[PDB]
């Protein structure tokens, strides 16, 4: 019966570089997104995203790799070695073998993926890069950072949109308990706020257009909500397995006790109003976990700001918690942060988990006015502070109706 | 004790539309490798691919809804379709809830990517389709399916280059034994012979450009090989629980007993000289089935017909089999059937499993004049008979260092 546990976080957010500043930013409400500057967005309907500021990986990725990788994967490296490094784990020969990485993305490189198009466009197939491919593909991040340390266990990388993040780490976790490694880096990075990235959901009318008031815009469970907000980054935790990790006296910052999956079958991008599918994967993560609803104080929400998805959503948690309902706390860290997609279910988690470390539970920010029978808590301007939170649980439900769910418990 | 065995296949080829008819054409050596004609090839240094012929998906898809989908989503949906069917599986309220999805593809919807961009480029961010995301999106198979049958179980979208098939469907088996699934659809689809695939791998030079002789290309093990050839395509198992098929009277075509997965740790796309990373992977696999590698009759190699590529994995095979060299048998599909990338993992894992039924082995045709020093026993020319064969190995070995491997047992 092998316990996982976490051990190392990496991270890179609208509201900060490093684990902990972002983490500040957040309990302090601070907003990261701001107007896209990158691009002409004067055609574009949505002129503003949660950005990654004065990213640097001078140190880290000799200038002469970078070429040979789409952002996202820049981003996934930095935050992996962050993890890596925050995890105190030396990689021996006879370590490699039992080490891995868990690392997916939702879209992967649209940025190297528009350069070398336009490429071909004006130039034809020359003009197209030899590394067009492993710098835009979603593996890549795994790819190279098993590379970088030597990792030779099983890596994996799952695409499943807005649920990557939660599905990587969980798998990393079955993984690790299954026999297969002992240590897994799991995790998911973004870099969708380009000119396909954000016509592309434009096109779809899932973005917000608030452009005169950009911090505004992500307002999850607000009446005057209109879409989803995109967010840049990445997030990186060290899975690894209880004895391991006691063995070789590692911070441990909490344990992974559940998690579980379900799928909507219902729309291949809204969900159903019922929320039968969230309700399944919530259920499935406590039964996995084996713990009830009401032993859970925080629940880090989808929560994307899309008018049919708070609601499902809402609606969900009411219905696996019934009596619960507003003794739980909601939140969605989305209202700073926008949707990191594939990243946003691993950043997530890193909330979840440090909730449970300070006690502390960040707000849903932008909450003015609640939905029509909402009676959720849902953490409305301020962090709450807590008690005797032991479980917290994390929420993806994304596109293709693919759900996730993860638990964490303190200490 | 969970046991997973397989009950429902399905498969879209170069070299046939049906899982029967692909088979039959690969026992007889036929080639699917012909000249790409849907795009002007001539400044590409490939100008042949393995195509699926005569596609259609009329009766499967409505028009209306293909426009919402890719080529690739569309080849997983019909060779999904067929597998469910071939199952007999009936999909029930009491049911749904316990079955799933793991199906996955390396590079995703490429053709909407390039067009979708073509419009961008010519005319803003408004000729992008407002189906763009989710029409080449990785997942969108999984998500299509899973409303088509309304399947509610864990839904997941692995996405590791030429070792997708294999992990989607090791992790499809991993779920159903752990108990978060009863039935699950695993497999990948691919459909890269675009401009952007053809020139992007064109462009990393590890295309074969043998375009005299487009048949004689796909030649691994040769000496005159010249890299890859690009095969488009989808395969699809119906995997489920051992008492679950029995207490239902359905086909079991076979048994899924190992999956080992491993990391090169070397370079992002070439392999060791070692083969070090693909022998862990088959070592784990065995260790996982509990078996030795003298059980073992046939092994469905990775094989893409690169130069550096078939040497590494020679090297594996006779490092895992030591005496057993030359008395295993082993092969590469891909020299009738090309690379399918994503798929590859799945359309081989079913030869792994028919060749199991017929105790039939398909050849590496076009291996005209071996190696050095190989020692190895590589089915050369004809399809090899054979008598005592109870488990087979599939061999996937990925661009990132990624690498799987899957054993399947008799009945």
């Given at each position: 019966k092998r316990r996982v546990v976490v051990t190392g976080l990496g991270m890179l957010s609208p509201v900060g570089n490093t684990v902990e500043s972002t983490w500040k930013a957040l309990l302090a409400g601070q907003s990261g997104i701001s107007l896209i500057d990158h691009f002409d967005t004067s055609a574009y309907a949505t002129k503003f995203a949660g950005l990654v500021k004065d990213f640097n990986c001078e140190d880290i990725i000799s200038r002469k790799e970078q070429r040979k990788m789409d952002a996202f994967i820049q981003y996934g490296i930095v935050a992996g070695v962050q993890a890596?490094?925050?995890?105190?784990?030396?990689?021996?020969?006879?370590?490699?073998?039992?080490?891995?990485?868990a690392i997916?993305?939702?879209?992967?490189?649209?940025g190297l993926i528009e350069?070398?198009?336009?490429?071909?466009?004006?130039?034809?197939?020359?003009?197209?890069?030899?590394?067009?491919?492993?710098?835009?593909?979603?593996?890549?991040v795994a790819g190279h950072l098993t590379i970088m340390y030597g990792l030779r266990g099983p890596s994996i990388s799952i695409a499943t949109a807005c649920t990557s993040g939660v599905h990587n780490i969980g798998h990393a976790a079955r993984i690790i308990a299954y026999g297969d490694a002992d240590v897994m880096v799991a995790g998911g990075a973004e870099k969708a706020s380009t000119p396909l990235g954000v016509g592309g959901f434009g096109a779809a009318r899932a973005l917000s257009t608030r452009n005169d008031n950009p911090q505004a815009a992500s307002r999850p469970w607000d009446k005057e909500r209109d879409?989803?907000?995109?967010?840049?980054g990445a997030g990186m935790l060290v899975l690894e397995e209880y004895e391991h990790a006691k063995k070789r006296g590692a911070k441990i910052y909490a344990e992974l006790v559940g998690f579980g999956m379900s799928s909507d079958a219902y729309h291949m991008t809204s969900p159903p109003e019922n929320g039968a599918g969230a309700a399944l994967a919530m259920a499935n993560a406590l039964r996995d976990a084996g713990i009830e609803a009401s032993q859970i104080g925080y629940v880090n929400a989808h929560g994307t700001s899309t008018?049919?998805?708070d609601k499902a959503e809402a609606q969900a948690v009411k219905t696996i918690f019934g009596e619960?309902?507003?003794?739980?706390?909601?939140?969605?860290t989305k209202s700073m942060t926008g949707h990191l997609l594939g990243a946003a279910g691993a950043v997530e988690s890193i909330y979840s988990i440090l909730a449970l470390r300070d006690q502390a539970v960040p707000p849903t920010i932008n909450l003015d006015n609640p939905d029509e029978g909402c009676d959720l808590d849902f953490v409305p301007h301020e962090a709450r502070?807590?008690?005797?939170?032991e479980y917290t649980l994390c929420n993806s439900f994304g596109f293709g109706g693919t759900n996730g769910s993860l638990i964490f418990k303190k200490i």
């Open positions: 890596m490094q925050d995890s105190g784990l030396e990689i021996t020969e006879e370590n490699a073998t039992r080490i891995g990485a997916g993305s939702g879209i992967g490189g649209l350069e070398n198009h336009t490429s071909l466009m004006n130039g034809g197939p020359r003009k197209i890069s030899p590394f067009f491919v492993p710098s835009t593909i979603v593996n890549m879409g989803f907000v995109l967010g840049d008018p049919a998805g619960a309902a507003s003794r739980v706390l909601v939140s969605s502070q807590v008690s005797g939170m």
